[model samples]
Target: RPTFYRQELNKTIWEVPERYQNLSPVGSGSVCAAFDTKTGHRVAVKKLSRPFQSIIHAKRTYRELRLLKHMKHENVIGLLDVFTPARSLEEFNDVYLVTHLMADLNNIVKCQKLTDDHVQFLIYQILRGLKYIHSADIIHRDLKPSNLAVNEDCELKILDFGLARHTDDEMTGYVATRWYRAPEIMLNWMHYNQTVDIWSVGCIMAELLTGRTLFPGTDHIDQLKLILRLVGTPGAELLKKISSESARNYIQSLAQMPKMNFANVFIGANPLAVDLLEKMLVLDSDKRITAAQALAHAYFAQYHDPDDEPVADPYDQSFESRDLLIDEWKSLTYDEVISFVPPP
Candidate 1:
C-alpha cells in the first residue's frame, strides 16, 4: 500500500482527497496525499491502482486490509478511513486507504544527525511495532527505511502495506530486498521467521545514527558481501543450516570475513548504540535478536518498562494457501472493507 502505491503518480487534482489543500503527489505513484483542511495533519492517501482487474489485484486489497485492520499500535500507522467514490458498483474501480500523516524516514535519514536519545527512542518505537507484528504471526516482509513513517518530532510508525513484488510465482514473494536483505533470506528457500523484520530495524537504526545507508549494494550477492564485510561471515554451524547447496558453496568460496568494529564503523557512536546495533545486525537470523527479544534488551532498559509493552492479537494466519479467483478474492476484500473492522 505504501511503496508500489507510490509509483506513476497520475491523477487529476479532483482525484485528491476533498477538503485537503496542497494536493501534491508524494511519489510518482498511485498514492497521493495532501494536508487535511480540518485537522491540518499531513495525512497520506493511498489508492489501489487497479482494484479488481484480476485475482492478483483483488488479493493485494484483501491482504492489506486484512493485516492492517487487525494491527493497531502507537508505533504503527493507523488506518484512518477507507473510501471509494464511484457512487455505484459499476464505478467501484478503486479503494482508498488513509494513514496518519508522518514524514517518510527517507526524507531525513540522509541528513539528520540524531542524538543518542533520538536513536534510542526511534529504534525503540520501531522495535515496539515489530514486536507487535511478529507476535501476531506476521512478517513485515518489507521493512525498508522508506516504509517507516516518521514525524519531525522523531516519532516512528511501521507502515506494513507496501508494493508487493507482482509475480505469478510464490518464490518472488520470498525474495529479500537488495539493499537491506537478510543473509538468511539470501538463501531464500530455507524456513525463516519473524527475525527478518528485526534485521531491517537494525539496518534503519544504523542509518539513523550515521546519516547514511548501511549496505548500499548493486545486487543480491553484493548485498551479502557488503554485510559480510561489516558483520563478518556466519560461523560454519550457521552456514550448515543453509538448505541451498548453491548458495552455501557460493558464500563459502568468498574470502573469510571478520566482524568490523562498531565504534570505528560508526564514528562518534556510543557503546549502548553499538552493542544493540551488533545484536540486530548479526549474520544469522537465528542469532539475530527477535523483535520481542530486542525490545527487552538491556540497551533499551533506560526507556522501556516491561509492563507498558504493546498489546496485539495472538498469531493468526488470516490468509493462507487456497488458490482464489478474482470474484472470490474481491468478495473477501469487499467483506473486510464494508465491516471497517475484522471479526474478532
Candidate 2:
C-alpha cells in the first residue's frame, strides 16, 4: 500500500520516498525538480510524457535510456540514479528518475551579459559533447539552449535525449523545434546525417552571442525566408536536391537573398568566432563543418587537448537492439539508483 502508480505502457514501477522533501516544479514544462536530504544535493526529476501509456513514448524512453547509458562524457548528462519506495516487487508501479540539479541555460541567457570568452567556452563544451555523441554514431535532433543545463560557473551539459537517434531517415518532417530547424530537414531532402546537429549548434551559438534568435522564423516557410535573409538563398542545385517540386519552385521563386556577412551579423564578436559560425551555418550539408572539425578550429585551440580527439569506436558497439518490458525497465531503474547511491 505504498505510494506508487503503474506505468501502463512500459509497465515499470516507480516511487519517490516520503523522506524526499522540497518538491518543486523546475520549469514551465518538460522537467520537474526536487531535492532529497539523504543525498544532500539538489536533484531535478522529470517524468516522461505519459511514458508507459503511449507506444511512441515507450519507444522514445528506450532510446533515451540506451543512449544515456551508452556514453560517459563530461558534457553529456549522466543518468545519476532513480528510486522507488515499494518494498515488494509486486507493489512497484511508479518510477522516479533522478538527475543533476542545474539551472537552465535559457535562464542564464536571459539574466547574464555573457562575454566572447564565455561564448567560446560554452560552445566548446557543446561541441565536445557532440564530438562524443557523433563518435558514438548518434544525432541529438534537438539542441536548443533550453535543453542545455548550466551551473553558475558556466559548466555546461547537454540533456533531453528524447529526440536523439542513432540512425537517420530520409523522409524529413518538422521534427525539430521550428526556429532552429536546418535547411535540408526543412526542404524535405532525402537524407541527412549528424551535420543536422551542427546547424542547430550554429543557431544556438548565434543566439548566445547576439542575445537574439538568429532566424526567428514564425512558420516553416517563414522560417525558410528568415534564414534566406540572413545567409542568402542557397544555390539552385541545393534546391534541385529536394524531391518536393512545389517546395523547390517556391524556393526558386523567392528573390535571391545575398548572404549577410558574418562580421555584420555577429558584429563586435571575435573574428575567429565569426568564421566558425560561417562554417557551421552552411546551406550545403556536405559542406557543413563537423563537430570534430569545429573542435580543431583556432577558436577553441587554447581550450582543447592534443590527445582529445574523437574517440574512435573500434569496438563497434550496438546499443539499441531490444525493447525493455515493464519489469525489466523497473529493474534497470532500480539498478541505476543502487549503482550510484552509496550502500547503507
Candidate 3:
C-alpha cells in the first residue's frame, strides 16, 4: 500500500533556510497547503489530515495521486514528488504529496484586467487541459477558477486533482463546488460523466468575462434554479430516472423558472465570449459543448497571438524603470502597486 510522510516523520525534510520560510500560504484544502517556496517555486504539500472518513475516500485520494503521476500536459499542474515518512504522532497519518503550485486565475484576472485576447487564450488553454483529462476517462469532480492557476508567462494550468476520479464505472453523483456543478448532478441524476467538468468550464468562462460568478446563489436548490433560469428547465423524460421524489419535484419546478438568454444579460460583453458561454452552459449535459469543441470556438480563433498582444500592465507606475516592472510584476498584486490603471 502507498504511504505518505507527515511533518514529524523527519524534521530534516521539512527544514529549509529561514529565508525560504517566507513561503506565503496561497490556499488551503482539507489536507494541504498551497505554498510559494523560497526557490520562487510554488508547490502544494498535501500532508495527512483527518483519517479517511471511509475506505472509499482513502482509495479515491490515492487513486487521484496515481493518475496525476502519469499525466503530462503544460496546462495541468505537474506532480513534483511524493514523500511518505514514518508516523511520529499517533494522531497524524502518513500520506503526503507535493505538487507544483499554480497561480490562481482569479488573481490573474483581477490583477491583469485581462484583455479579450488574453481571455480567449486562457479559455483555449483550459479546454485543452480538460480535453486531456477527459481522454483519460477522468472526471475532475471539482473545477473552478480557484483550482486554475496562471504562470508568469500567462499560461493557465489546472490544479487540485483531489476530486478527480476515473469514469470507467458509473457516475458517482458526488457533486463538487456548488456554483460550478452541473444541473444533472443538482437534480440527483446518477449516471453522468466527464461532461460535469464542461459545466464548470462554462461557469468559469462566464466568470472570466464578467468578473463575477454567473450563478451566485446562496443555496443548492437556488443554484439549480439559477442554472435552469438561464438554460430552461429539463424535460420530463430527463427526470424519470431520478430516484428522489424531492429532487424530481425540484427539477419539475424548473419549468416555472424564467429562461433568459445569457447573451442579453452580458449586454456590453464581447459577442465572441457570449457565444462560447451559450455552448458551455447548456441545460442538457449531453448537449453541452465538449472541451475540444470549446477550444475551437471563434473567440479563440480571433486572438491567435496572445503572447504579442499589448495587454494593460497594472503595475507599470510602481517601477522606477521599465526593467523593474518587466522583471517583478508577476510577484506584485493590485494592493502592492502605486497605480493599477493605465496612463491616459
Which candidate leads the pack in lDDT?
1
Best by TM-score: 1
* TM-score of candidate 1 versus the correct structure, residues matched by position: 0.84
**Which pairs clash inside model 3?**
4-84, 4-94, 4-95, 4-96, 5-84, 5-85, 42-101, 103-149
What is the overall TM-score of model 3 with all chains considered together? 0.69
Writing each residue's lDDT as its tens digit, candidate 2 over 1-344 gives: 22533321233222456545556665431455667666677777765545444444455554555556555777888766555555755664444566668777788887899988899899999998888888877777777888899887899999876353323342233333566768777656647788989999999998889898787765667777778788888786677777777777777788887898889878899999999999999887888998888898999977987576556343232535656665565555445434553323
Error of 3 at 99 (Å): 2.4
Q: Write the per-residue lDDT of candidate 3 for residues 176-264, one digit (tens) a residue.
A: 35677777775456677888888888888777777877787666667766777787776666567676888776566544654587778
Taking every candidate in turn, the Cα RMSD to the unseen true structure, in Å, is: 5.3, 5.7, 15.0
TM-score-based ranking: 1, 2, 3
Q: Estimate each model's TM-score.
A: 0.84, 0.79, 0.69
Which of the two, 1 or 2, has more TM-score?
1
